[PDB]
Design a protein around this ligand. Structure first.
Ligand SMILES: *[C@@H](O)[C@H](CCCCCCCCCCCCCC)C(=O)O
Length: 463
């Protein structure tokens, strides 16, 4: 396998140079508090805040306090205050104490019943600097990026890391896919590193490759093969599209049943994505695409044309299917080591230990056919899931998950983002992991702090 390219090393040197010269912002510190009883939890938050108001407490670094907190027994009733300084922490703890809500405070009476679903989508989520910050500041994250970087170099001949590190480089159809995949793989292994794991995975479109890997349905290598193949064929295919060959994609706020109706006016439109229960992404000849939009606006419905000259998940894709078959020959579909809600196979569930689904044909069917995303999520809700965690550079899919959950009578779900444009990426992950903790999912909160060197790494937190 190829190593990290000299150009990446150069860009990295310059990135760390830029980084060294920034004003140093206060880290986000997760402060855990638990008990068998909420009432005990509440009072413990009270004592802890009281003491933090005191000189001894005021003299103890938030980090040292959180470290000690992370070493207590973690009860059924859990809370986390996310804080940058003592005041934020004290204010936050008062909330926990009063049982009141606040943005930086999470507090639940008992652990969530069922394990989390990992949502891996990616469309719409890309942005200039995605994953650069976390790449420079998290070794685990970084090591995983470099592993996908190396594999993509092998399959395609270029370095995804270079794209991440180079502020002047923007993303196209092909490079979005492989890079968002890189970030997805890396976020999920970071999450695994801290002891977290998915109960089930669901893929959306682009994200199906990462979902396959995390569900243990394919090795990293083959999953990389899967995203690489589709990406370049799609990216190279759409660049060649002009005039009468062009096919647009567009989100319209119509349900599946509204579409059956609406479509009788447009004979060449197809469904790309059933995104939400009244949000559908369609595709076809640009005049028809323009007309379904015009008629959406004439009804006060949301409608958004995508930046592309070709429609994935439509008949247009047929000519690619042959080369796709050939380029994926040899991949080894394995048996899922967790649940998969397959949005390719109509949102249906596959059981851990079930038969392999990720065969060459699956990728062929994935690209050709509709993405049943709202049905997947609905399936998940119905069978008990309430925690949906999205591995993305921007939590765009959670916006869809929200509409499906609400529609299904689940009015409070645990919708957990990861990275977000214009949010600190380290703070982001600390918050993700804090949530997993508070809802009582697997997460070794001890790992959010480094091994203590001396006794100053601890705090005299009240009994
Ligand atoms: C899912 O997120 C993702 C959607 C990305 C949109 C890319 C546009 C599709 C490209 C069209 C290629 C034209 C090929 C030429 C045929 C002759 C997805 O991967 O589906």
């Amino acid at each position: 396998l190829p190593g990290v390219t000299e150009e990446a090393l150069r860009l990295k040197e310059a990135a760390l140079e830029e980084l060294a010269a920034q004003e140093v912002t206060a880290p986000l510190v997760p402060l855990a508090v638990s008990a068998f009883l909420t009432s005990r939890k509440k009072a413990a938050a009270a004592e802890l805040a009281d003491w933090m108001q005191s000189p001894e407490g005021q003299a103890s670094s938030l980090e040292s306090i959180g470290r000690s907190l992370s070493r207590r027994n973690h009860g059924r009733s859990r809370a986390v205050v996310l804080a940058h300084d003592h005041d934020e922490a004290i204010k936050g703890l008062r909330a926990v104490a009063a049982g009141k809500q606040a943005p930086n405070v999470f507090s639940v009476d008992g652990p969530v019943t069922t394990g989390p679903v990992w949502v891996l989508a990616g469309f719409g989520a890309q942005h200039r600097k995605m994953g650069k910050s976390l790449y420079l500041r998290n070794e685990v994250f970084a090591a995983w990026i470099e592993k996908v970087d190396a594999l993509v170099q092998d399959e395609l001949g270029y370095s995804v890391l270079e794209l991440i590190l180079d502020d002047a480089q923007d993303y196209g159809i092909e490079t979005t896919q492989v890079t968002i995949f890189a970030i997805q793989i890396a976020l999920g292994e970071l999450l695994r590193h801290h002891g977290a794991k998915p109960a089930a995975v669901i893929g959306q479109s682009l994200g199906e490759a990462a979902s396959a890997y995390f569900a243990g349905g394919l090795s990293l290598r083959d999953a990389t093969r899967a995203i690489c193949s589709r990406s370049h064929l799609m990216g190279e295919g759409e660049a060649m599209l002009f005039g009468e060959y062009i096919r647009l994609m567009a989100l319209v706020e119509y349900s599946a049943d509204e579409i059956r109706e609406v479509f009788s006016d447009f004979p060449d439109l197809e469904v790309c994505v059933y995104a939400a229960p009244t949000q559908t992404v369609i595709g076809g000849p640009p005049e028809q695409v323009d007309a379904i939009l015009a008629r959406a606006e004439a009804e006060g419905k949301f409608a958004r044309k995508f930046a592309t000259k070709g429609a994935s998940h439509t008949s247009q894709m047929d000519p690619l299917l042959g080369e796709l078959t050939a380029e994926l020959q040899g991949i080894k579909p394995t048996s899922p080591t967790c649940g998969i809600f397959s949005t390719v196979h109509e949102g249906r569930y596959i059981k851990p230990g079930g038969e392999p689904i990720h065969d060459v044909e699956y990728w062929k069917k994935g690209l050709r056919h509709s993405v049943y995303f709202t049905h997947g999520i609905r399936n998940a809700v119905d069978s008990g899931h309430t925690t949906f965690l999205e591995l993305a550079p921007n939590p765009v899919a959670l916006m869809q998950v929200a509409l499906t959950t609400a529609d299904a009578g689940l009015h409070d779900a645990q919708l957990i983002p990861t990275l977000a444009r214009k949010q600190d990426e380290v703070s982001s992950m600390v918050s993700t992991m804090a949530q997993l903790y508070v809802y009582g999912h697997d997460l070794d909160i001890r790992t959010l702090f480094s091994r203590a060197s001396g006794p100053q790494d601890y705090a005299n937190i009240p009994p």
